[PDB]
């Protein structure tokens, strides 16, 4: 009893083996997330009692926004080290443009990407 | 006026060029969807008036379900040609298991994958 | 002294971070191989004295050949578990077709994929 | 007569459909190359007389070298538009560093990536 069918696709990830039509109970397969996506949780799913266990999630990278940076009077700190796309968990460092200073209540100039979202610092003249 | 920043990531797809920090108005880039995903719409985005145009969508493949097929008394027709994963737009063909016949109001035995969803035929004894 | 430039592409693999134009000595990045490719060695490269260390290799999966199997009078053992593509290190199990037996000096019916190569068993009438 | 087995893997590319164990004569499948790789030739292979036709090639992107650029006294022209990786067919534009000029017999400052190779311009003091 308890065989499973082919393992479920997940967004932005792939299993590391060729899918089969049927799997014995206790069988397992593993996922990997695509390059700039961070795999959250356990990469392995196991077949038990007719069902696969819960696959991991592939957490989204963050893209910097020209519009937001212009609006907030900030720029990337490191011109030769531009993290245009950042992994979830990775930090991006900004600076105030010439003639501006960190606003009160602003997030720090260094900020961390989480699943697509960057909380940008804000500078004022 | 009207330059754009780095192009947006999309689920299950990738741009075909290396991202740049800034793009001139009229610049374009192109997406491709990952292998079993079907690109819906125009693959190209263009920068105009400070904004990228709308990226395409990557339509999901369909995975056959052992549980559903067992419940509906069906199996794949072609044992040597098993579309365990099907592309959006692609058809999958089932048969009634021995001793069963297509129920009334059942979908045809041939059915088409659309963005992850297969409408399965149902057989009754 | 000793900064590095952008990390080298490798066949069938990708780095897990966004490439930068320059890296400080002691910086590191990591590779992942594409889904059915097996990463051989250490996934991490480190920048020292102006040079990246040696990247890993992505070992090739194996595809079964209809022509070879027909010529050798063999078939896959498990009709519902067809490893049409196998990872390096993974085993594939064949059987002699009806009316044939393992030849003398033949490889065992179970055989392991290594970097694209399967050593097929041979059956004789 | 003339059925084919599963289609061949190619470096840095993937087929766009789920592989099957057997294909009828006249069947076809299609490849796509991974994002910064340029597909050379016809993306489609067709099964005839027991054999697949010849798959396309995925032409390699080019990575700029810090060491070579330093040795040749050049830098990227566009600081905000750095093609750290370039597609085959795509051009990269350099400039002489301050205090240098294009050497005689040097390649032009604009140069095209071909299957991994850039022919770099050289500047002299």
UniProtKB/Swiss-Prot annotation, chains A, B, C, D:
Effect of residue 78 to L: In AHUS1; about 40% loss of C3b binding
Effect of substituting residue 83 to A: About 50% loss of C3b binding
Domain Sushi: 2-60, 65-125
Tissues in which the UniProt entry reports expression: Expressed in the retinal pigment epithelium (at protein level). CFH is one of the most abundant complement components in blood where the liver is the major source of CFH protein in vivo. in addition, CFH is secreted by additional cell types including monocytes, fibroblasts, or endothelial cells.
Covalent S-S links between cysteines: 4-47, 33-58, 62-113, 96-123
Record annotation: effect of changing residue 77 to A: About 50% loss of C3b binding
Subcellular location: Secreted
Top-level lineage group: Eukaryota
Post-translational modifications reported in the UniProt record: Sulfated on tyrosine residues.
Coiled-coil ranges per UniProt: none
Subunit composition and interactions: Homodimer. Also forms homooligomers. Interacts with complement protein C3b; this interaction inhibits complement activation. Interacts with complement protein C3d. Interacts with CR3/ITGAM; this interaction mediates adhesion of neutrophils to pathogens leading to pathogen clearance. Interacts with complement factor I. (Microbial infection) Interacts with West nile virus non-structural protein 1 (NS1); this interaction leads to the degradation of C3.
Linked pathology: Basal laminar drusen: Drusen are extracellular deposits that accumulate below the retinal pigment epithelium on Bruch membrane. Basal laminar drusen refers to an early adult-onset drusen phenotype that shows a pattern of uniform small, slightly raised yellow subretinal nodules randomly scattered in the macula. In later stages, these drusen often become more numerous, with clustered groups of drusen scattered throughout the retina. In time these small basal laminar drusen may expand and ultimately lead to a serous pigment epithelial detachment of the macula that may result in vision loss. Complement factor H deficiency: A disorder that can manifest as several different phenotypes, including asymptomatic, recurrent bacterial infections, and renal failure. Laboratory features usually include decreased serum levels of factor H, complement component C3, and a decrease in other terminal complement components, indicating activation of the alternative complement pathway. It is associated with a number of renal diseases with variable clinical presentation and progression, including membranoproliferative glomerulonephritis and atypical hemolytic uremic syndrome.
Domains as described in the record: Sushi 1-3 domain represents the minimal unit capable of cofactor activity. The property to discriminate self surfaces from non-self surfaces depends on the C-terminal region made of Sushis 19-20.
Function recorded in the entry: Glycoprotein that plays an essential role in maintaining a well-balanced immune response by modulating complement activation. Acts as a soluble inhibitor of complement, where its binding to self markers such as glycan structures prevents complement activation and amplification on cell surfaces. Accelerates the decay of the complement alternative pathway (AP) C3 convertase C3bBb, thus preventing local formation of more C3b, the central player of the complement amplification loop. As a cofactor of the serine protease factor I, CFH also regulates proteolytic degradation of already-deposited C3b. (Microbial infection) In the mosquito midgut, binds to the surface of parasite P.falciparum gametocytes and protects the parasite from alternative complement pathway-mediated elimination.
Protein name per its UniProtKB record: Complement factor H
Gene: CFH
């Amino acid at each position: 009893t308890g065989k499973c069918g082919p393992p479920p696709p997940i967004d932005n990830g792939d299993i590391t083996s060729f899918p089969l039509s049927v799997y014995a109970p206790a069988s397992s397969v593993e996922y990997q997330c695509q390059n700039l996506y961070q795999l959250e949780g356990n990469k392995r799913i196991t077949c038990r009692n007719g069902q696969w266990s819960e696959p991991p999630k592939c957490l989204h990278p963050c893209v910097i926004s020209r519009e937001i940076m212009e609006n907030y009077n900030i720029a990337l700190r490191w011109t030769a080290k531009q993290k245009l796309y950042s992994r979830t968990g990775e930090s991006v460092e900004f600076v105030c443009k010439a003639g501006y200073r960190l606003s009160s209540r602003s997030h720090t100039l260094r900020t961390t990407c989480w699943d697509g979202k960057l909380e940008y610092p804000t500078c004022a003249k």
